[PDB]
């Protein structure tokens, strides 16, 4: 029956996308570090290493935090359209689903800090959680500029609305705020370590530490792909196939995240919160207001 092979082909496309995203996150752990088997080497090194949960800790919360740090942004990828006919879930909510996963992602840091029976790791986790809340508070509006221009929450509709002018030009402030918010919500440089406060990844070892790392790089994949989809026309290109254009733009943004890590220095903690709130939230509110006035005038 054509219906069964159609649904099986769609399921195979979704599984292929998921495997490509996971392997891309691991391969860019290597790329942030020729040696193609080096990733496999650390993979089975952490796989075969013994695991140590602290004795006076909470087992369920400690085990649960890396699962959140992986699956949150891994599930957030599912709205991204790669090419015509290659989407996983063409949701009506779309970018709302990305906001849902980004909201659930903070529990990984909080849970790791509490379950790690250590006051320093707990303090570091509270600091990192305050930081990521301070940037999650305007992530959604930085995407609302694009939503307001497109008039829908769908991603394919946004890409089709980018058919002539990419939203990097009119939503350049939305571009900038979503770039900073995507970097800060992923807890990477220059928002990598805000820490009497030590890291919340201490007492984590082996495969849980591997989960934290691969979840961070999977989040980088998801953020760069959504970056391309929202602000750079998605798959639209004159000559190359749409899959190829999406791949080059996603790689472009992924090595630019790597370059920002390798180049930019780390601001202070209070400086990070002050910049986040005081600059980026009123800037994004003003950007959405001006966007609404522009589209209503036309």
């Amino acid at each position: 029956s054509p219906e069964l092979i159609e649904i099986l082909l769609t399921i195979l496309k979704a599984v292929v996308i998921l495997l490509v995203v996971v392997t891309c996150g691991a391969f860019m752990s290597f790329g942030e570090r020729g040696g193609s088997l080096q990733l496999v080497a650390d993979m089975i090194k952490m796989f075969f290493k013994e695991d140590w949960i602290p004795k006076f800790s909470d087992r369920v919360i400690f085990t649960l935090a890396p699962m959140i740090a992986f699956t949150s942004l891994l599930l957030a990828f599912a709205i991204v359209p790669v090419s015509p006919g290659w989407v996983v879930a063409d949701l009506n909510i779309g970018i709302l689903f990305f906001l849902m996963m980004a909201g659930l992602a903070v529990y990984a840091v909080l849970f790791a800090g509490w379950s790690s029976n250590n006051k320093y790791s707990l303090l570091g986790a509270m600091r990192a959680s305050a930081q990521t809340l301070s940037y999650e508070v305007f992530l959604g509006l930085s995407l609302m500029g694009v939503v307001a221009q497109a008039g829908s929450f769908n991603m394919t509709d946004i890409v089709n609305s980018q058919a002539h002018v990419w939203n990097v030009i009119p939503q350049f402030f939305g571009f900038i705020t979503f770039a900073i918010a995507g970097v800060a919500v992923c807890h990477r440089h220059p928002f990598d370590q805000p820490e009497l406060a030590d890291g919340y990844h201490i007492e984590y070892s082996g495969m849980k530490f591997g989960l934290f790392f691969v979840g961070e790089y999977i989040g980088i994949v998801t953020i760069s792909a959504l970056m391309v989809t929202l602000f750079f026309g998605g798959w639209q290109g004159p000559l190359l196939p749409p899959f190829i254009w999406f791949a080059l733009k996603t790689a472009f943004f992924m090595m630019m995240f790597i370059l920002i890590r390798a180049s930019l220095p780390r601001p202070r903690y209070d400086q990070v919160m002050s910049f986040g709130w005081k600059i980026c939230l009123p800037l994004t509110l003003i950007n959405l207001l001006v966007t609404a006035a522009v589209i209503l005038w036309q």
Binding site: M100, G103, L104, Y107, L110
Partner: protein, 158 residues
Amino acid sequence: MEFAFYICGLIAILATLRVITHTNPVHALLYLIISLLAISGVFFSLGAYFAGALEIIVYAGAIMVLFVFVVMMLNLIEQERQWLKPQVWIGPAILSAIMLVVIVYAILGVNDQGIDGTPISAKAVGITLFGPYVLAVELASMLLLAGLVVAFHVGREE
């Protein structure tokens, strides 16, 4: 749509039952987050897509984060487990059961043509919110400003 509704309702009921009886605060908050996720799934089963997205974004993603933050900074009655022995919850449990049975007696006997499950999108909710609901929106911003002022006045350290 009925399948997801019934499993999510059952998960929400079970998670709430673990919430109100548990002793560890972080565990109780985790069960509460699970119940909120289930309630969002119920909202998605009904077609209220905006409500489910808001149940994850605002309830589980903001309010429970605040509760979790407060519990972590407390570093926390627990030892005796008063609420477990039947001589404490003998009264309130049957009181809530009587209230529940009266309420569900009122529920049974109304016009019920069923829920279609047609998705009421967030765009239509926005048109309604910024059409015939101007004063609800402005005074809800006003109310949230009031709550912000109160919570800063009470909760600051000095």
